[PDB]
Structures are given as C-alpha cells and as structure tokens.
Symmetry: D2
Subunit: 487 residues, 4 copies
C-alpha cells in the first residue's frame, strides 16, 4: 500500500505521527497514505534549506540556470509518468495534464535565463567621480504553498524562479494530490541541484503555520482560495516577512452581438469545463449583451455540450474528469441546487451525471445555467466545478459594471470583432488578466500572472518578471575612490 513522505535535503523521510488518505477521485477509492508533517519536520526542511543557502547564494547564476536546463529535459522525458500521477489523484485526463505540464515547463524555460533577469542597473557619475548600481540579491529561505488543481504547474510558478534567483525553497503542496508534485521535485536532484536547495514538506494547516512562524522564512508565496489567501497574507505580514497570496475567481466573458458565436462557443467549452471547471481562470460566467446573443449562445452551447464526455483519466478522449473530493462534489451540486431554487434555468443538468460506468467516484457532468442574476449566491460565489452561468444584459457597459461590481477580478474576456470595444474593455475593466477573444487569458511564462481586487494580496505577481523581484531584495551600492595615491 505504501506511504508518501517528504523531500528534505535530497532524501525521502517520513515522520509517522499522523497520516491522511489520498484518493483516486474517479473510483472514489483510497489510493495512498500521506504522512502529514508536524512543526518539527517542517523545521528540518527549513534547516536544510538554510544550511544550503550560503554556497548556493554565491553560486553563479549561469551555473544555477544550468540545473533548470537539465530539469527541463527531465520533465519532458518523464512526461507520461508525471501526467499519470496527476491523473491518478487529481483525476484530470492526459491532455489537461499535458497542458499543465507544458506551461510548467515554460516557467522552467523562462528561469533558464536567470542571468539576463538578474541584471542590476549601473549608473556612471551620480556625482563627480562617483558610481552607483543596483543588485538584486537572494532572500534566503523561501516558502511556497500550492493548491490541488495544478499540483505541477503552480509549484513550477514558484521554485524554478526562486531557486535560480539564489534562494532555497520549502514547498508545502496540496494534500489531495501530492505524488505528482513530489515526483517532479525528486527529478531536480538528478538535474544536479545540491541537496537542501529544494525541499517538499507534505501536510495540512500545521505545516503551513510552521512555515509562517519560522524567522528563517523570508518570503511566502501562496496560491489558493481567497479566505486562505487572506489568512496567509495577514499572518505573514504580521510576522514581518514578505508575501504574495493569490485568491479565487469568478471569470466573466462578454459576448458582443458582433462576435463570432461559433468560435465563442467552441472556446467556452474548454474554458468553462476544461479540468472539470476546477481552474482559477475558469470561464464560469458568460454575460450576453442582448438576446439576440443570449438565445443563440445558450442554443449553440447546449448543442456542443451534448458531445462532452465525462469519465476517468484511464480513458483518453474524455473531455474532463472527476471533481477532487466527495466534499467538493457535494458543494458543486449544492450550488446548482441553489441556482435552480433561486430561479435560474438549468438548461443542461449534470448533477446526476451517472455517465460512469463502474464509478461512484466524485463526478459532476457539464452544466449550463441560464437567466442568472447578481442576487444569486451561486453567481456571487466561486463554484469551482464544470458549470457555466449566463447573465443577460442590455448594453456592454452594463456587463462591465457587473464585472467590476464583483468581489473577484482575476481573469476576464470579451468576444468581439471591433477594435474600439476591445480597447475600451482592456483599458477600463478592473481585472488583472484580460482576454480579447481569449477566454483563458493566462500570461505566458515570460509575463506575470495575477488578479486584482480580492483575487490577489500583495504588490508583486506570480512567475515572470515580478517573481524575480519578489524572490530578491534590492541592494544599492554607491562607490567612490578619493585616495589617488597609487595612480
């Protein structure tokens, strides 16, 4: 049966004081036991990282970046096993898993260029005969905390950049799918990373708290839900240390009268239902301006939604897999019930998927909910399942007001052919990542990802250029040589 441990100073260790089930959400069956680290075990991770830091701090960027060059190859060689371990515990089918991995590898690609990214600014004669320049030096031991829905990519947002910027890392990944995460961390030792520089510590709140209250932990990167994001951000900030905490979302798309409805519907299938809707960039609300477009959207969407296939990752050619836990399934079903009960139209019901087939695991089918209103709880709250909701509004400004009024502002999209409507949208909308005929406007590895309003806490975003600034601290040197005796 076997137990999943911790990666510390290049070794798998296990504490054996407390454990938890990891499941196979397709079958609903218990897969593996996860050892949950207490504060003592987390402190061994931090000691390891802290002990590794001095030599790695002085390790030239080029040499640190060569680890990520080799790490990239290894990610690619082991792609199928990685995807398999993602699939086994998350449930997502090969092509979502391969997409996640690829974007992860892209973060590693970006980090391979650390010497360019770590260039300071040099200034000649700030005064007469006086020079000055900036350096972005390493923080020390950095902590990372990651959610379940991307057990590979979201870690790769953090440790690749952090490590290559000269820090040492302690990762505390989601307990609901830790194998895929640990698998990639172990690859790193093969890629030539010294022992201690990357550590993986599995657990729950106790592990996270220990990271937040250790003085050696100089920075905390968090990606998960807003309620937790906020806790992590307030707590870290209250102990002095720097922090970036990315929260939840309710991504809206405006479908304009001039949009190509076919292309819009085809893209909204993937965006809304891909990865079972368990995405921070999930396109969960379609705001149809007119109807007109409302009717045509719900019509064509219904049609395309019939071809969707829900089932386990063992079957490639499914479109998406199960939800992560029974609890989560019950929550998603709850939200659909709430929508119907508050007056919404369940155009396509997937509460009772029953599509499987030797599976009482945690499945939810693709669901379409029409005539939803801002006073609906299901609209206000993040469902985080395979659900798409439609609001109908009179004008484009009304849809933008509706978006700006929301708690979250992570991601957003406008479908249109008109250049003016696209600029006015991208300029004025109060969300961090904007798409133009792109329902998942995820920034590429060489840009930074981050929402606005309650979707992000902090002033530096995730991965990309901001991660360089977040995983370093500015030192400014001012130099002068008055004593000209030798010359």
């Amino acid at each position: 049966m076997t137990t999943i441990g911790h990666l510390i100073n290049g070794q798998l260790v296990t504490e054996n004081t407390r454990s938890q089930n990891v499941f196979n959400p397709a079958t609903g069956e218990i897969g593996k036991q996860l050892d949950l680290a207490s504060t003592k075990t987390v402190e061994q991770a931090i000691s390891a990282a802290q002990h590794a830091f001095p030599t790695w701090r002085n390790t030239p960027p080029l040499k640190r970046a060569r680890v990520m060059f080799r790490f990239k190859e290894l990610l690619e060689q082991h792609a199928d096993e990685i995807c398999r371990l993602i699939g086994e515990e998350h449930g997502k089918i090969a092509h979502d898993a391969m997409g996640e991995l690829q974007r992860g590898i892209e973060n590693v690609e970006y980090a391979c260029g650390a010497p360019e990214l770590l260039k300071g600014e040099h200034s000649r004669n700030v005064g007469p005969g006086i020079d000055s320049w900036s350096e972005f030096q390493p923080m020390g031991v950095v902590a990372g905390i990651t959610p379940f829905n991307f057990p590979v990519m979201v870690p790769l947002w953090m440790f690749p950049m952090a490590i290559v910027c000269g820090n040492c890392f302690v990762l505390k990944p989601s307990e609901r799918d830790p194998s895929s995460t640990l698998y990639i961390a172990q690859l790193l030792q093969e890629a030539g990373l010294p022992d201690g520089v990357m550590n993986v510590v599995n657990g729950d709140k106790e592990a996270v708290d220990a990271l937040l209250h250790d003085d050696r932990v100089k920075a905390v990167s968090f990606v998960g839900s807003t309620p937790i994001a906020e806790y992590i951000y307030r707590t870290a900030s209250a102990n002095g240390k720097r922090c970036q905490a990315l929260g939840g979302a309710k991504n809206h798309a405006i479908v304009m009268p001039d949009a190509d409805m076919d292309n819009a519907v085809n893209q909204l299938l993937g965006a809304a239902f891909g990865s079972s809707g368990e995405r921070c960039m999930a396109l969960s609300v379609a705001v149809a301006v007119g109807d007109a477009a409302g009717d045509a959207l719900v019509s064509k969407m219904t049609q395309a939604m019939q071809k969707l296939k829900v089932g386990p990752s063992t079957d490639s050619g499914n479109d998406f897999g199960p939800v992560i836990t029974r609890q989560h399934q019950e929550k998603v079903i709850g939200y659909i019930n709430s929508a119907e009960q508050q007056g919404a139209t369940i155009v396509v019901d997937g509460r009772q998927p029953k599509v499987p087939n030797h599976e009482n695991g945690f499945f939810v089918g693709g669901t379409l909910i029409d005539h939803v209103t801002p006073e609906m709880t299901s609209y206000q709250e993040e469902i985080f399942g395979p659900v798409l909701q439609v609001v109908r509004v009179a004008t484009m400004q009304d849809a933008m007001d509706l978006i700006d009024a929301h708690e979250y502002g992570n991601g957003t999209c406008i479908f249109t052919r008109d250049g003016e409507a696209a600029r006015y949208f991208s300029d004025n909308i109060q969300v961090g990542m904007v798409g133009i005929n792109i329902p998942l406007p995820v920034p590429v590895a060489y840009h930074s990802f981050g929402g606005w309003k309650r979707s992000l806490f902090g002033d530096l975003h995730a991965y990309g250029p901001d991660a360089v600034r977040f995983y370093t601290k500015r030192k400014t040197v001012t130099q002068r040589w008055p004593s000209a005796g030798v010359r």
Copy 2:
C-alpha cells in the same frame, strides 16, 4: 497664534475640534497651533482624491509630467522661504535645508520622465497570431505618511511619483514641522495640478488610522520609526491594501587601516552630526579595525569636533541646529548618560551645550563616545541625535559580523583604498544601502531607497524605479482576432 490647517481639494480648511503645539526648537517657544484632523476630515480629503481620480487616471503621462516640470521650477524659485519654513520648525540651518530640498527636487526631476517609466512590455506572438502586453495602471487614492526629520524631501519621495503615475494622494506629514510640507503642496496647484489630486491632511494617530481603515485608499507609503512602521505594515495588510513602510537605523562605518584617516574623519563629521544627527542615514557608529586606527580616529575626531558650531538657523554658518522637541532632547541626553554608566568613555560631552546664547531651546552639542560594546543599550537602540559612538574590533570580519548582527540594516559605509575589501564588503554585508568611501550612501532619485532586516517592511523600496511599481498595478492583456471576414 495662527492655526495650521489642511489642503483639501485645493483649499485651506480647518476642523477646529482639537489642536497641538508646533515649536520653534531654537527658542523653545510655541510658534503655531496645528489643527489635527479627525476621521471625518480625512474622509473629506479621501473623497476629494477619489473624486479627482477618474479624469486624472486618463490624463496622458506626458501632460501629468508637465505638472512636475512646472513644480520643479516653483520649488527652486521658492527655495529660500521653504528653507526658512524648514528651519523655523525643524530647526535645521539653511545649508541642511537646501540639501534636503535639492534631493527633493531630484525626485521631481525623475518623475518628469514618467512616460519612459510607465512603459509596459509588449510581446509578439506568444501563441500563433496572439499578442500580449503589460500595463502598469494607477492604483486610485494613495496614502503617504512621513516623519519630522525630512518634512520636504520624504514627502517628495512619494507624491510626485505617485501623482505622475496617475494616482491621487493624501499626505499625512509629521505634526512637529508641517509648515514646509504644506507650503510645497500649495505650489502644486500653481504648477497646474487639478484640485483634489493632491491633499494634505494634518494630524496624529487618529488621521493615520482613518487612512488605514478607508477602503478607498489602495496603497500606503510609510516612512518613520520601526515600531510604527511595523504597526502600519501589519495594519494595512490586515485591511487588504498594499504597503511599504520604512523604519529606523543604526548605520555603521568600518574604518580600515589603509583608509585616509583625515578624509574619513572630515566625512564622518557631517555624517554623524549633520542635521543634528536626526537622520535615517546618519552615520552613528564608527567601527575601527585595529587600534592603530581606533586611537587615531578618536584623536583626530576630537580635534575636528572642536570647530563645531551649534546654534539657531537664524545664524547661517552653524553646522547644525537643535533637536526637534524637549522630549527628544531629554531622550538623547538619556542615551549619553546610559553610555557613560554602562562603561563608555564620553570623549567629547555635549549634554550641556549651553552654546546658545539666548536659547534654552532643544540643543544638544556634538558628543563622542569611545569604547562602546554590543551589550550597551545606547548602541542597540537608535539615538537619533548628534552622537557618534566608536567600537573597536580586531578584524574587518568582526566589524561586518557586528553590523549583520544589528537589528537594523539601513545604511553602511567602508573607508578603504583596496578593491577586494570593498567588493567583499558590498556583496556580503546585510544592509540595503552600501557606501565605499561614502558615509551617506543615499541613492539618487533614479534609484530606490530602502533598508534590509527591520529597517523596511515590504518588497518595494522608496522612490525611483520601485515607486513606479508600487504606485501602479500590473494588467496583462492577451489579444487574438479570430475572424478575418473584413480582410476578405
């Protein structure tokens, strides 16, 4: 008795519910009453900023920067009266005042280049036919909270950049010397700034708290002591808004054997005793390696210290002025008494300056303390007065270990001629701003200021490039155009 009010939506207003004395620290007499804003008056300032934002947000960076161009010249034209105002309330003498104002003008100069500074990064074909780019858009209403020691410069670290980045501003300056701060903000209207974009709200902890608890304030720049910085950071973070908070200092200089001890000592005078040592980059400890240098340092320093002139800003030619308040004066004297009692040699004693001369105001003369050790309370804490302490150590590493071990890590200096020592020092030392033969390694306006350890809270430092990233927020747009119907 005149009463000092508030700049809100371009007009001087005053609440009159509660006030507080501003002193002329040279004479010790009460000069002026400062009206202290309550939560209602602060909210009026914020409402004025919120109200001005939408149209300032969309004003082109070029046109915003032209307000700073005219602001530059207004600062220069009114330089004498601004230094008078500083001198009147802080106490600092003309040349210190002008130095501050100059470095403040430089912040303005740098802000004049906003359109360069607000460049986003544009990416062609992130996917096939798909472009993407970044924009650093304005925050909204920004709050700024500044200390007494620099009533002009420190404010100019914040609102010029913040405003020219398309935000509106509510400034909350030190209650101890507000006249100068208010004067510069008033010039801003003459420079062509719309009403409400800049506001200045005077007050104490109550006005600060109003700013931290208002949801319309989206960012809070603080510069002050660590204890308060720590509070402001924690409190802002608990209310969701982003924050930078700068804190206290104990700046050390290593004096190496090879250094020209005359250059060192001449440069330590102004660093230790300039602005009466009331400076976040004041060089307050001189670590001498060997002795050897220890003796020579204390010897020459004493001599150079005898030429020092303490006295009011009405006499130019004084090196420095009084300390800010009586409470502070007493505190500074206390640290000197603490040093004495804990074993330190008081080489030059300025507890009893008596140099003035028709002034029982808040004066403390230059003092020199030798043989200080890490266990002394006056070494551990920030004195923030005209005091220089000397510590003696065997090797340069012992000096560096001693610095790294200190609570603060704002600023440091090494005096030497050798290149190896300077790099080893500048690479490894755990402080934010490093000088090689520069006792005040204060970054220029086109760099950013900020300490390490407990001298700063946050990940974006003050003024220059970081201030651009702190007063704006990142939006990434990804663009794609599916149907080519109009083409064909």
Copy 3:
C-alpha cells in the same frame, strides 16, 4: 543686407568668403544672406567641440540634464519668435510651426531623463567572485545634418539627446531656413551649456564633406532625401565612423470599407496638406479598397478641401504656407501635370493657386488626384507637396502588396473599425511606423522614429531610445580582485 553667421565656441562668427540667398518663400524676395562655411571654418567648430569634450564627458548626467531642463523653459518662452523665424524662411504658418516646436521640446523633455536612459547592466558573479557591467560612454564630437522641412524639430531630434549623452555637437542645417535653427542653439548658452559643446556651422556640400572626412567626428546623424542620405551613409561608412541616415517617403493609407470616412477624411486633410505636404510623414497616397469607399473618400475629401486656405504666415488661419523654393514649386507643378498626362483625374486643381494676393512666391494649392495607377511616375517618386493621390484596388491584400512593393517604407496607415484587419496590417506591412486610424503615426519623443527599406540607412533610428545607443558606445568591464590581504 543682414548676413547669418555660425555658432562656434559660444560666439557668432562669420567667414565672408562665399554666401547664399535665403528667401521669403511667401513674397519670393531675398530676405537675408547666409554665410557658407569652408572646410577651415568647419574645422574650427570641430576643434571647439573636441576641446570642450573631455570635461563635458566626465560631467554627471544629472548636471548635463539640468541644461536641457532650462532649455525647455527657454524654448517655450521664445516660442513666438521661433515660430516667426521658421515661418519667415520656410513659410509655414504659426500652428504648424508651434507643432514642430512642441515635438522638438518633447525631445528635450525626454533628454532631461538622461540618467535613467544611460543606465548600464550590472551582473553579479559571471564567474565565482567576478562581476561585470556595461557602460554606455560618450562618442566624442558628433555631427548633425538636417533638412529644411523641420529646421527646429529635426535638429532637436539630434543635439538634445547627443549632448546629454556626454558628446559635443556640430550641426549643419538646411541653408534654405537657418535663422530659426541658429536662434535656438543660441538659447543653449543661456541655459548653462559650456562653450563649444554645441556648435552650428552653416554651409553647403563643402561643410558636409568637411564633417564627413574629419577623424575627430565620430558619428553622423543625417535626415533628408534618399539620394543624399545614401551618399552620407556611404561616405561616413567608408571613413570608418558610425551613421544613421533617414531618407524619403511615399506614405500610403488603406481606407477599408468599414472605415469611419468622416474621420479619415478629416485627419487626411492635415496629414496630406499640413505643412504644405513638405513632410517625411506626409500622407500622399490614399489606397481605397473597393469603390464603394473610393467614390466616398474622393467625395468627402473634395468637400472638406474647398474650405482650405493657402497663404503667407503673416495671416494665421491659413491652413498651410508656400513651398520652399521656385525650383521646388516648378517640380510640384510638374508632378501634377504628369498625373494628368499619364491619365489620372485632377479632381481638385491647385496648380494655379493664384490665391495670394501680393505674392508671386512659391505657392501651390491643395490638390486631389484620382485614378492613379502604379505605372505613373507621380505615384513612384516623392512629390513632397500638397497633393493627395487616390489609388483604387480590389482587396486589402492588394493594397498591402502595393505598399510593400514601393521603394520607400517610412510611414503608413489603415483606417478600419476591425481589429483583425488592424493587427494583420500592423504585423505584416513592411514599413517602420504604422498607424491605426492615425495617418501621421509619428512616434513620440520616448519612442524612436525610423523607416524601413530605402527610407533609412543604418540600424538605430532617430531620437528616443535608439538615439541613446547611437550617441554612446558600449564598454564592458570585467572585475576580479585576487588578493584579500588588507581585508585579513
């Protein structure tokens, strides 16, 4: 009669061996005499620049920039007199002159931020204990050669940025309108510029060749006609010095069926006929896709064009002024005769403007030619007058293919509401500066200006960021300190 001199080492001088007439192109009369400098007078200017360079090179960028801060104030203060001078010798009316002046000041504004722009790249630990960094240091004596159509702005593309980058400058402006150019360079001394850093040397081919062949001149920025641009580039390259040479143009605008015609027509008026079309960014060809839009553009263009006013710069409210010379006026009349001969439809005739009114000067009225084809010589060659030609094509791609085929590739535009078409245009079109519903897509001072294909020779464009790189040379230092004796 009045003789115009040279500015060499901070003083007006004159050679008086040889001269040329400067006209008032409104009246056709000879206004002043321009002293033409010889290879020996040129060499005096270079000598003055070379002599001023060593101390100017080591002058802090902040101090260099402060000159431009003062220069900006002065150019604004003297704005009326500068526009009057431009108007008197070029002919352009107040508003076009101010427009020129404004854009020139924008270059100056960008120059004021030199310390940022001159930032190198520092790299920590390129190997163990080895650091390296780049410095963009000054060139030395730089030469500038400018055309007639912008006797203020194009010079302000060059010397503001060049001087602030630590160089000294020798300017050789167009001999058709030198007063305005010399006037603004005289303001530079009053701004605090040392003598010799900036110099103006008036002349002809002789003065140019003199600059090209002197080994002390280290970089040449030329802006003018292709044929001369080519010669300058070839000649400077042959002598071993670096060079940027901007040449001619024939800017097209695609008018798609989904375009707002009222808006396109209204902006084409100023783009085609502004500054009497004597503009490197002048939009001289409107390519209508379909007709449909052809018919509609010509219809609305015809109507708006009836309200145009041609005349002398003494009457403001004139839309544009005369052409630069009698020769050039004959040339332009020729380009319009051709178009009618070779078959085109002269929809609005301005050949015989006869609009003035006490002026047998060099006036051409706004003209509109319709049904022009690629074979017509008047389509192939740059007219450089107030003439707008309309070519009709079947599809957008035909338009783009037509544009890409042309010799030049300076500037271009597409009028459309559709984003797909805009990106596909902006992405694939083979021209440097592309506008979307902007028939004059002139980059602002914080960008750079430069065309593709035959419109430009070199690899770094004018003003903006490319100019920092053109006016400085890369140095890379690599630093190591093998011995740690003193530290230990």
Copy 4:
C-alpha cells in the same frame, strides 16, 4: 581524400568547379579538399533562406527557442567530436576547443531566452485614447562571415541569436577549418530546425561578394581582420544593408607596482600563449609601469614559460598547438626577427621550437620579447601568434596614453589592488572591453562583445543584447479607435 561540401536547404551539396586544401597544421599534410562555392551556389543558399523565411518569421519565439534548447544538448552530446574536428584543422588542443565550445553553447543558452529578449515597449495614452508600442521584427535573410581561429564559437555568436530572432541565415566560414562549423550546422536539423533556415556555404572572396551584393541579404555580421572588416563594412554600406564588422587587436595589460605578480604571470600565460596567441583577445603586450615591476614580470614569466608544452592536439596536456598555416608561421617568425632586428631583447626564443617530434607542421613556441618600443613594427602590428611583448614606462598615465595611441582598442587589462586606479583606468581607457585583474575580459553570452576604434566598424556589437537589436528592425505602431458604434449599445 574526402570533399567538404555545403549545407543548403538541409542537404549536403557540392558544386565541384573549384577546390582548396585544408591542412592538418600539426603534421603539415593535406587532410581534406574544400569545395569553393561560386556566386550561383551562394544564390541557391540565399533562395533556400528566403523561401523558408515567411513561415519562420511568423513562428512564435517560444517555438523558435526550443530549437536552441535542443541544439544546446546536441552540442554537449557531440562535444568530443566537435573538439576533434577543431583540433584536426585549426590544431588547438582539447581544453582550448572545449573552452571554445563551452562559450558557444553559452551563446545558445542566451538565445533560448528569445521571448524575454524580443519584448518591445508598450505605451498607454501617448495622446488621449491613443496607444503606441514598439516591435522588433525580423530582418529576413542574414549573412554571417567568420574567421579561422574560432570556427565554432564565433559562428555561434551569430546564427543562434539571428535564427531565434525570426531570420534565416547563410554562413560563410573560414576555408582553413570548415569541418567543425558544418558539423555543428548539421546538428541543427536534428534539433528540429526547418530546412533552409540555416545554411553553410564554404568559399573565399567570391562567396563573400555574392552575399554582399545580393539584395535579399538584409544584414551582414563579419568577424575577422581589420583590413577585411573595413572592406566588408564599406561594401555592405554601399549596397544599403546594415553591417557590423569586428577587426584586429593589440591587447595591453598594465602591471602596476601593487599588483600580485604571481597571479598576473599565471594569468598572462593563458592569455598570451593560449590558443597559440591566435585570438582577438590575446594579451600580446604587458605594459610594466616602473622596473621594479618590469624586471619582476620578466623574471617570473621566463620561469613559468619553461614549463610550456607545444605540440599536436593528439597529445592532450600540451598547452597549445600549431599555428594555422605555413604562411602564418613565416609571418609570426617574421615579426620576432623584426623585433630583434629593431633592438628588442628576445628573452625566450620559440622561433625554432623543434619540440615536435615527427612534426614539421606550423609550430611556434611561446616567446617573450623585452624592451619593445612604440616605434617597432612588431608592436604596431598584430602578430597573432604565441608572443608576449613587454613595454616599460614611468607612470600609469604613460601606459594609458600608449594604449589610447594604438590603432586598435579591442580589449585591455589592468593588474592592481587599488580601487582608485581600477576605476580611473576602466572609466577613461579607450577600449571596448576592460579587465580588472582579468587579462581576458571576454563578455559573457548575456553581454555583448565589441572593440573600439579600428577594432570594430558599426554601432551594435557582437552577440548578447546588441545582437537582438542588430538581427531585428524596430517597428512602431500607433493605434486609435475613433468609432464607438458597437460598444453603444
């Protein structure tokens, strides 16, 4: 005896109208025949390039960069073979070839970061509701011309970055050692590059002139001698296309009194005599300020120089190999006589190395010349062999004036402990690449390489960030949307 061809559109081809010997310079024997491409053959390569360009231009930077990522691997995988192909024709021993190869791969590593490097600048509201932004789009077909001394690394200066920037490339390498260079170009197809995007066309002046005069070639990167750099720069500039031509060098090192003499000598061994001195960054002149340091330099340098090993690349552990050709050997010998004839002290003589050992190949031993003066021809001119000259001067400023006076200004070094002297030297010295206690201050792949004065023609330097700018063209877009019809309502 095999015939070396050309890589055109992903295939080996050979014209067979004219050929030339490539030697093994250790033995002095003709190894291989190099096919020389004529203007018709070059034009095929340019046509392959131009044909492949449109799709390659529109390929995303990410996808283009992944070719360089895969290429990174192949180069390291075939590292021994590449080093053998360099040793076989240039003559340089394993470690110098590996050194060369490693710096080249470094240039590949940098190119992998294309997406970051190709970021333009975006500006919001340059006027009211008007945005503008820059783009650095590809040139088209780009031509590269490289020297004999670095047949691997110098080509990696050019085509990795050029290709990843959206261009197609035609490479004309040195005819003296072409096998390594073709070998590395052929690994590029396996790394997933589309046919035609990279081309190698071997030849002499005729192939060079074909590239310069063909209108489809939009940019030319030349690395080589000053005379030819000047020719290439002039010619290119006459035919409208942009160019960067890097040239010769006379690299001086100022040995100050306070310098660590043991460290300087030890570092000056590799810098003077490494790769048999046949290096643009070869430190050929030591300027001893005082003597004092003159005497102590020559003393210690003579001693350490006794342990040098000259021989064939077959014996690893040799410090350096032969010179490239018999003609070049005679030239190098020549300059040493010339120095002796004009009054200079030949402290260590390597004219008659006679160290090999079954080799009448093109061998010159490490030589030291002392008491050289600015008036000597051997000092004015670039020797480009294993020869270290030492000038004596009174003061630091005299050493600096001497350097600035020289024709070349490629690279320089100063040995000192003092910070004031380092800065003053690095600030004021009129050469492009400056070292502080580093005799070979070669910029890393994330920087750019380029001398001053006559060592470089152009304004953008080799590899690094400048290559991004040289291998692209700036486009500025200004955008406005005047009609809000669809947004309303």
